[PDB]
Design a protein around this nucleic acid. Structure first.
Length: 234
DNA sequence: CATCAAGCCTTCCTTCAGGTGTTGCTCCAGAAAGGGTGT
């Protein structure tokens, strides 16, 4: 259907995972149901859900941003916005002179159509390795290529299934190359790290008309970009 | 290339003129009786 994008401006850039950690800490004391819905927690305990994250953070040049996929995530985002905005207002008025928190909103629709010609899409900060077997597949390009093709196709399929719209199942994908290889950290000052691709280029015969999320670590603002910008971006 | 506004308001009838004159029925619904005249 549609995905709603909420932009939060504080005058300074904070990273999406750091904003996720910061957002949880300020509201930990009060209103726990709002935090449970925002982070996609299970309704009983603190453990997050296994399924597709409806609410995820993203990147914003002067702050961070929220993505709510579908009507449920849009409603969760709709009820979350004033409490979170007041939380940054009190947090940034507690210290310093004070800064005006500035909000923005968009309701981006989602669409997909199959075309008989290849189309190019580039994704930045792409996490691909999460067990040892995926590290073994990444050593040889032939057996890592088909793994990446299946990962991209299953990512598109699970996002189409979670948003509630039908995706044609005759899509063919192709992967050209990635600019860099870098690690990501789950928590700061932790020895554990996950391998990741940087500026990866993919080619799909079909076209996409909105925000699309691919791969793992979707709730940390990793590996989603606006396709509607990328039609004819060059 | 996608949203982002994607109207608000308040007006939202007013006054008389809102007939006048005239027509407003007529007539006949008998049948001898005394004269003619025409076949």
């Amino acid at each position: 259907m549609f995905v709603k994008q909420v932009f939060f401006d504080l005058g300074a850039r904070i990273h999406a995972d750091e904003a996720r950690a910061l957002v949880a800490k300020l509201l930990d004391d009060t209103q726990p149901g709002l935090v449970s819905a925002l982070m996609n927690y299970m309704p009983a305990s603190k453990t997050s859900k296994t399924e597709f994250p409806l609410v995820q953070f993203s990147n914003f040049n002067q702050g961070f941003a929220l993505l709510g996929f579908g009507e449920v995530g849009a409603q969760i985002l709709s009820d979350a916005t004033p409490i979170i905005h007041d939380a940054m207002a009190k947090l940034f008025a507690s210290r310093g002179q004070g800064v005006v928190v500035q909000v923005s909103s968009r309701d981006v629709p989602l669409s997909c159509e199959k075309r008989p010609y290849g189309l190019q899409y580039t994704v930045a900060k792409m996490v691909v390795q999460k067990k040892h077997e995926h590290r073994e597949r990444l050593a040889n390009p032939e057996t890592g290529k088909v793994f990446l093709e299946g990962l991209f196709l299953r990512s598109l399929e699970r996002q189409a299934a979670a948003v509630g719209m039908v995706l044609p199942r005759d899509l063919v994908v192709s992967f050209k190359g990635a600019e860099r290889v870098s690690s990501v950290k789950l928590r700061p000052d932790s020895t554990l790290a996950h391998g990741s691709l940087r500026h990866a280029v993919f080619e799909v015969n079909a076209r996409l008309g909105g925000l699309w999320s691919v791969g793992f670590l979707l709730s940390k603002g990793f590996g989603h970009i606006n396709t509607d910008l990328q039609l004819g971006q060059g």
